[PDB]
Write a protein that binds this DNA or RNA. Structure first.
Lengths: 64, 97, 82
RNA sequence: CAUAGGAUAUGAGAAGGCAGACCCGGGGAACUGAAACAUCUAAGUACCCGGAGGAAGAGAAAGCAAAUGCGAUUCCCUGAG
RNA sequence: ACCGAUAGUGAACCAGUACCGUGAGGGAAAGGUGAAAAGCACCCCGGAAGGGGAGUGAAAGAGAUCCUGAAACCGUGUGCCUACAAGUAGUCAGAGCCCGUUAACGGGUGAUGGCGUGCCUUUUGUAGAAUGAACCGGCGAGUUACGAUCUCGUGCAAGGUUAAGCAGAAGAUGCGGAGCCGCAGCGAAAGCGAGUCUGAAUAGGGCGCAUGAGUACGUGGUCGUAGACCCGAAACCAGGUGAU
RNA sequence: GUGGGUAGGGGUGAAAUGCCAAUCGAACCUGGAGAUAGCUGGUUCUCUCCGAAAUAGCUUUAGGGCUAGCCUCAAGGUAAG
RNA sequence: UAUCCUUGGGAGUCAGACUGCGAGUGAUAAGAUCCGUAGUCGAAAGGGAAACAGCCCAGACCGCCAGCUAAGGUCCCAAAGU
RNA sequence: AACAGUGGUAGGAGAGCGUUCUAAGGGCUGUGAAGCCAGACCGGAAGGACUGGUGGAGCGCUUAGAAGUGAGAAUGCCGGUAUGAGUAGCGAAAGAGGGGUGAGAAUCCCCUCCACCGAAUGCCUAAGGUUUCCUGAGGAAGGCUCGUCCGCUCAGGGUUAGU
RNA sequence: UAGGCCCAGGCGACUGUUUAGCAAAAACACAGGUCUCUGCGAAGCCGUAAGGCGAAGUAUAGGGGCUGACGCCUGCCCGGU
RNA sequence: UCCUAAGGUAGCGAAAUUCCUUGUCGGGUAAGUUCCGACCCGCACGAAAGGCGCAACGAUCUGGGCACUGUCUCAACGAGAGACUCGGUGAAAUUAUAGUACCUGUGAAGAUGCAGGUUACCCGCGACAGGACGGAAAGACCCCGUGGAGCUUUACUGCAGCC
RNA sequence: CUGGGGCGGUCGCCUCCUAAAAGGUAACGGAGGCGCCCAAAGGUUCCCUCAGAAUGGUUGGAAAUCAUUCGCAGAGUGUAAAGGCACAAGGGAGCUUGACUGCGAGACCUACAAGUCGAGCAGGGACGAAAGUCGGGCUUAGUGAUCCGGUGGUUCCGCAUGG
């Protein structure tokens, strides 16, 4: 039988074009009275999964 | 898996939402029409069997990268704005199905 | 048998924020990169360097970096263009 | 009165087992996996019980689907991980 | 492009037997004379058993758990050595004596000398007083099924390729374009598109493309789900057999 | 002595957690089951080629694990080291 | 002098030891423990230190019945000057 | 050709050896194959032949493909065998002698006495045992020893009810 | 071939029973005491119903707990459970 | 004098409880850490977890005395059954190969094996067991496994059952 | 976690010393903090010294307040500590809320996730004549993932279409 996709890692990573992985930033769910304004513009963007952890979970979501 | 440390697929939030009603438009780079001659018929039934589009996924949109030189009877579902003028730049008609 | 001794009371430590020199002397340094991190302004910004809000050193311009002095016992970052 | 019951007679009427394989309903776990454990997984499988057929069970619409409409089910391949 | 008697059904054979267990159950061992029984009359030894001859057969060393018959091991003989030497038992020097082979700086013993503490697993570390094996022979551990991904390789390439099924000796091929991957992305999305979201902003940045190559398959390197590298728990649970 | 009764998550016990077929802090037998074992033992044919580490961070982890550190194989930009 | 970086397949290792200098813990006790930087060993045989992973020299493609040195040695075991 | 390097565990990388089976060619065998048994041969290595002796019917090479792919260690499975070593043990107990049988007898069969139990080591009979009971032959094993003998192996024979 | 006896001492009153196959007692049992449940389809029990144990019994009876013959005795605290 | 819901009364008391301890004081003995008699600065006795005292009882349990004794100073001898010996049969645990000296010294820190020396002809047999960390049992104690099974209650969520 | 575990002590952050004149480095090694606080204790504008001592003096005393010298510093720095700071970051007054939204080439740090730094650009501001500063507080602490549901605004979808 053919492979699954590791579902929780599919609802959180839009696979970009040209072979990279997009993610969102953390620390952004609920608690906001103690992080200043400057972090908040830094953490509503997206980012890329780094070269270290990409080696680990590239198998989980190689089915787009 | 990370031995007990919180694995990377959880400490990141969920920013996913998928609608039923999405439309994969067929993607034509407007330059495969240069394989044809000018004055020919451009229908989505013709773009399938000529090998231009391998799969009509309910909608044929024509993009605008590149250029044409051929007056064509172009009818299709949707059009990008530069593609509507590029067909007229070759003098071709720009019917919208 | 063994007489059980406890009472540590001192077994903690912070983690150090990484101070010291960052860009070497005479190095071609682009604009807006950091030169030096310090708690308390030991080395003042001089030419073409401003004092940060967290009183570090950041280069306004491009070019090379020198360290002259403020005369008696006081230092300075001087950055010159090309 | 009449019934329970009793007696008597017609009944290739039934019951029982084996393919340790197959299906259909009724009852129904657990180690393990989750790096621990309960919801969860394990799986409605293991075993147990009734049914039958050589197949069974579903089956001629109170269904898909949203086009200038198909036409009872079952199964395969895709959809698709 | 299955096994050839420790393999293959537990069972090639009186095998679900013989035996173990009151019990539910467990569950072995053991195939080969020749082409033909022609299977040894006859003579000796002994009570035979068992030979030695003879005869049979091409072979009798083929003669009754009967082809081939190795090693452990038990030996019978003899070439060289040994009863003042300590000795992981060898090596390398090395006379004497004994030798004449796949004919070449030979064969076998070696009085004596010098260096010298087994293999394996696990360890910072082992001759180890840490484990493992009495040796001898056989069996016995990283496999396929499906998908992922990469390199190498094949054919076509801005197009590659068919699944099920039909026919056809299970096959090869033909038919079969239903789908999937790719040639355009970015936005969760509507929507837009060589640009795209955020934005009030033709600003600036994010990821895109400008410097295009994929896909069908195949050997491999791993990986996902599968007993998934073998051997091993104690234990849980179900259905039953047992107060000889 | 003889003939029966009570069954395992139960029986039974003038009580010990003793007895229940040489078994008992939950009997026995085939079943799920090639359970699971981050643990221990084992993993066979040869040469050539280069070749390490035992530390950091985090972890109910501390003898386990993943990422980075250090090694090999390939392809490059190249002379940057 | 040539080794770096980038991309990708593949790992193993995350229990380490000891000698000198630089500290802590200790009793300026340990072949103790926790590290720093440097060695060796681990994974490295050979020679010396009588023998000896860890010190002092030195790296083993393989053969010869040749030559030179290092650490350490030169009365005799045991090669070299009484 | 020149220059340089070659210790290596875990670990990566590259080349090859060999068994079983198949595939086309070729050949080689009752004028003796496979195997086995020996050596002093060759290849850098796993290795590969070549005579000689066994054996009495099949099997190599060249290139390919498929693998249940190769042992020396699992307190490994399964046989075969040593080790201790002719060493421990020979399962309570009184026989000795004379004849007889027989190849052979401390034991077997006889007689003689002395022995031992005797609320049992004695007679009946359940439980069970299933042919052991009986006579007649037989000694390859079964007796913790020999053995002519027997609870053993052979061919016969043996239980009777009205209560 | 069939008792060794005498002085005291705790612990158990006593004969009885168990740790088949380490442990025979100072443990259990025991008569008696005693507080309490329970009006008969009793309570308690087996165990989801039945059915017929308790009992062909009926508070001078039957389950349950606490102690251990007898003799002298059993005082204080209802705040928490 | 504060605090309690209330502060141990009767009888016992270095106790099957008692730590300091062998408490002190007396009898038992020449000598008495145990035993009995009394003392109470009862660490931590106490009233049905029962308190005390009790004649009869026990393969209980401590202490003392007589009787008689190889238990002992201090061994001796005798019978027999194994042992050794001569025929009969004949295993087993264990077992890397094994021509296996002992002193130091070193080493995974405690040698048969290596180094330094020291002594020792070869081969059995009867005995002793100092050693091979002698065999039998992958430690019963001890710690880890994210092991496990019995037990427990005011751990957590549940369930049966009576409400 | 553990110089065998047990109990005891600790678990993340911030600063110092160990640390070996860059950064980092451990010990159940040495010393103390934090789970805030502030509407001015921020923003600018402009203003100006401090701690003690010494005198002189009602009550007033060692030490209130007044002058008065000498005093680059001994104090003050919302708060631990180190590093700074007497050109203010110390101390006052006025006016105001930049404790601004969208960002940000570039770096430091880092296994990851996080955390840091900032020129400059825009829209709108505050203060000041202007230049210019202001993206909280003298820097480094003053707190935490996601999943989860609550909450306000939403040219976002909404299962035939309208909601």
């Amino acid at each position: 039988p053919k492979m699954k996709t590791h579902r929780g890692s599919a609802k959180r990573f839009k696979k970009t074009g040209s072979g990279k992985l997009k993610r969102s930033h953390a620390y952004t769910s609920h608690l906001f009275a103690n992080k200043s304004q400057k972090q908040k513009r830094k953490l509503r963007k997206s980012a890329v999964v780094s070269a270290g952890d990409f080696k680990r979970i590239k198998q989980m979501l190689a089915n787009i | 898996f990370e031995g007990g440390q919180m694995p990377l697929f959880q400490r990141l939030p969920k920013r996913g939402f998928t609608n039923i009603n999405r439309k994969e438009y067929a993607v034509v780079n407007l330059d495969k029409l240069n394989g044809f001659a000018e004055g020919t018929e451009v229908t989505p039934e013709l773009l399938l069997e000529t090998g231009v589009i391998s799969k009509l996924n309910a909608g044929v949109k024509i993009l605008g990268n590149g250029k044409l030189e051929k007056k064509l009877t172009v009818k299709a579902n949707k059009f990008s704005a530069s593609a509507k003028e590029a067909v007229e730049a070759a003098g071709g008609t720009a019917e919208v199905i | 048998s063994k007489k059980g001794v406890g009472s540590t009371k001192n077994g903690r430590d912070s983690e150090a924020k990484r101070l010291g020199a960052k860009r070497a002397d005479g190095q071609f340094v682009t604009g807006g990169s950091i030169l030096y991190r310090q708690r308390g302004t030991k080395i003042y910004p001089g030419e073409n360097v401003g004092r940060g809000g967290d009183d570090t050193l950041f280069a306004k311009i491009d070019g090379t970096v020198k360290f002259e002095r403020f005369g008696r016992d006081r230092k300075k970052v001087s950055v010159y263009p090309v």
